[PDB]
Symmetry: none
Subunit: 123 residues, 2 copies
């Protein structure tokens, strides 16, 4: 766990090259990225930065043709405020460009050591 800060891991470096400038995102997203890939291995997982709402998120396609996966990095220390999720919905709905559909997203709750707990949150 010596490098999850500098950029020695290619996948980690790959993530931090995002045009936002947030070390917390890159760390937390890296941990969940490794879970998604090495545990559920979906068709496609991407890392998208939304500078205007100020958040980075992993969105991809569960199954090609489909999508419905938005996972956001969230450390245990982050308490839940409905204001943010409302902004997250807006973020996802905007990037998916779908005309105001009832959707949702999964909170990736990470402990700083290794425990990722996926908490599924809906509108």
């Amino acid at each position: 766990s010596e490098d999850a800060w500098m950029g020695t891991h290619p996948k980690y470096l790959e993530m931090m090259e995002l045009d936002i400038g947030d070390a917390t995102q890159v760390y937390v997203a890296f941990l969940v990225y490794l879970d998604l890939m090495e545990s559920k291995s979906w068709h496609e997982v991407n890392c998208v930065g939304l500078p205007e709402l100020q958040l980075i998120c992993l969105v991809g396609t569960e199954i090609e043709g489909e999508g419905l996966q938005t996972v956001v990095p969230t450390p245990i220390t982050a308490s839940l405020s409905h204001n943010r999720i409302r902004e997250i919905l807006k973020a996802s709905r905007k990037l998916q460009g779908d005309p105001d559909l009832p959707m949702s997203f999964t909170l990736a709750i990470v402990e700083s050591d290794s425990t990722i707990v996926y908490y599924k949150l809906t509108d």
Copy 2:
């Protein structure tokens, strides 16, 4: 045995005798009930059924002298919606008999590995 007619744990049996009729509540609430009692230590843990809202919840006194503690059972595969939480707020607020106090509640997230993760959500 004398408590294995329906279940097989007296405390669990106590919990299912609630007037609602939900096996998910009794399972998940039992796991968190045992955590609260044996691990987190409370002074009073109650299990209250709100058939109106279709939720069951544990409310008691973490410390008797206070009067603000509400924990709701939420499985790791449940979907928490901002819609639900405002309903949960309404549930707790009518339970404690105050219609305007901005309050909060804890989410008791239970993993399939029996891992209870307390996630504190605020209004």
